Every structure is written in C-alpha cells, then in structure tokens.
Write a structure and sequence with these properties.
It is built from seven helices and 16 strands. The chain is of the alpha+beta class. The PDB classes it as transcription.
Length: 324
C-alpha cells in the first residue's frame, strides 16, 4: 500500500513535468553522495553570499546534506545537494585568494587546516566530491570590478546599479554598490536578473542608483564610470536564457521552504517566464510560493526515490493546514 508516483497519477488523472523541462543538475539521480557525517569543508554563507566559512556535514539524506557552521549555533544549519556549486574542498580559499570567516573563537590568522583537523580530530571531505574548485573556465566577459544593472531579487520591482565582486568557476557575484552584501547573489551570464549598463534607459524603466548617491535624481552612468574608472560588462557577455516550459498542474517534487529537511509532492500552481509557483498537494494555498525554474530545490517526480531521500505524500483531507 506504499505511495508511488505511478499510482498517484492514475488516481488524480494527472501528469508530471517531463525530465526535459529541468536542468541536468536538478534531474541527475545516478551520482553517488560520498559526503559523510563529520567531514569538513568550505562554503558560502547562503544568507551572506560574499562570505566563506568552515562547514561540517551534520546530516546526510539521499543526495542532500545538512551543513553546520563550525563553532556557531545549529540554528544556522542549512541543506544543499551534493552537486552544489556553493561548497568547496579544504584549501580552496587559500588556493583561489579568497578570505575565510573563521570558526567561532578563532581569529582569521589563527586558522590553519592542518592544525584545525588535529584539534577537531576530523577529516576534510575529499576533493573528488566537489563540482566547484576553481578548475572550470570563468564566465566569459564578466570580471571583478565591471558594472551592470541588476534586479534586487529581494525587491524585484527594482533594477539597480551593480558590480561584479567575485568570480568562481562558471559564476559571478552581483553586488549592489554602496549597499549591504546580504543583498548580493551568485549568477551566470544567462541570468534573467541582469542587464547591461544602459538597459533601464533603453527600456524606459527607472534605475535605482547606489545607496545615498550624492544627488540621486541626476545619476548618470557615464559620470559614475569615470568617477570609478570602472568598465561596463560588455553587452556580448549577456546571454538569453529561454523561458521555461512548465505548465500549470504539472507535478514534481520540491523542498519544503519552512522545514528544508523535507521534500514533498508538488504541483505547478502558476507560471511566469522564469519562475513557477509551487503548491504542495493537500496543503493550504497559504504555503504556495514562487521559485525560479532553475532553483536547485525543485526536481522531477522520482528524484527522491532514485536518490534515497524520503518523499512526503500529500496532506490528508480535512487535516489542519489542508486544502480541498
């Protein structure tokens, strides 16, 4: 009497989102997850994405892992997939010229991997697990210091003056000039959230200048590039990603945003060019959420079963928090 997709589709007269609609990295199920509890590594802080910390594997589940910030509270723990580009092997920050935010109780120059592994009686995750370790070709045409226009992903009505502030493998970090780094996000040349200098003017859209720019209303890119000596990212570097082809009512699997340990049976509730709205089957519409179609936490039906992760079935009828 166990839950299966095949049976559910028959019961519901429903269809799945084809595997072809997903990025290969969202769909891949045949890779081994070689990470083990206690292994140490390096990674970005997902809520402060310019910063790198020492992390420990706190839990393994299928193709996913829960990462802990060494020395800090378990409240900051977070989940990634084993093919995440946001994690790197011990030694990566030194090799690539990045800075470390050290474990609690350590000053930066008090941290050394060999001593730290001795102190903690631990092992580093081996290098042959990581898709990202500064071996891949850089994103063509995007260099640190170049400027561009970018959507504030947290306030997506705004297109804003931005800079490239880091480049790692095929991606780069978008930073909003004179604002906090917690508005930064990682990107590739095909992102629908970035544009060349001058795009807002060509589109008739208002451009948000750097925080507190002396005389905001009169902001001028030509002047700003002269002031900074910076170049614009060349127009040729920006590439179009095609709109996704998910359709309303297609079914798939999605990580629960409120309890990221869990993955649930999901439906496409609404669509935009580059985002989908997820409804969790059986649950209140109050939990529906928009997500980018390329987000790493949506997957084709079957992904949990094939990777060894539990799948939460639809919430039962008339339970608390349910929908008809």
């Amino acid at each position: 009497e166990c839950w299966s997709w095949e049976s559910y589709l028959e019961e519901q007269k429903a269809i799945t989102a084809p595997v072809s609609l997903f990025q290969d990295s969202q769909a891949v199920t045949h890779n081994k997850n070689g990470f083990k509890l206690g292994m140490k590594l390096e990674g970005i802080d997902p809520q402060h994405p310019s910063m790198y910390f020492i992390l420990t594997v706190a839990e393994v589940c299928g193709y996913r892992l829960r990462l802990h910030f060494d020395g800090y509270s378990e409240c900051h723990d977070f989940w990634v997939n084993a093919n995440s580009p946001d994690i790197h092997p011990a030694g990566w920050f030194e090799k690539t010229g990045h800075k470390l935010q050290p474990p609690k109780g350590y000053k930066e120059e008090e941290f050394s991997w060999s001593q730290y592994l001795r102190s903690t009686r631990a092992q580093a995750a081996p290098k042959h697990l990581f898709v990202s370790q500064s071996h891949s070709p850089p994103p063509l045409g995007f260099q640190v210091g170049m400027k561009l226009e970018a959507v504030d992903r947290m306030n997506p009505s705004l297109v804003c003056v931005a800079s490239v502030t880091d480049v790692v493998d095929s991606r780069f970090l978008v930073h909003f000039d004179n604002w906090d780094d917690t508005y930064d996000y990682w990107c590739d040349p095909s992102s629908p959230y970035i544009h060349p200098v001058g795009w807002c003017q060509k589109q008739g859209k208002p451009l948000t200048p750097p925080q507190d720019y002396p005389d905001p209303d009169n902001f001028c890119w030509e002047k700003y590039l002269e002031e900074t000596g910076a170049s614009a990212v060349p127009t040729w570097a920006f590439k179009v990603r095609p709109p996704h082809s998910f359709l309303v009512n297609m079914k798939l699997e999605a990580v629960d945003r409120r309890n990221p340990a869990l993955i649930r049976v999901a439906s496409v509730e609404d669509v935009e060019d580059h985002r989908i709205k997820i409804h969790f089957d059986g649950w209140s519409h109050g939990y529906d959420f928009w997500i980018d179609a390329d987000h790493p936490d949506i997957h084709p039906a079957g992904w949990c079963s094939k990777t060894g992760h539990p799948l939460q079935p639809p919430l039962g009828p008339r339970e608390p928090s349910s929908a008809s």
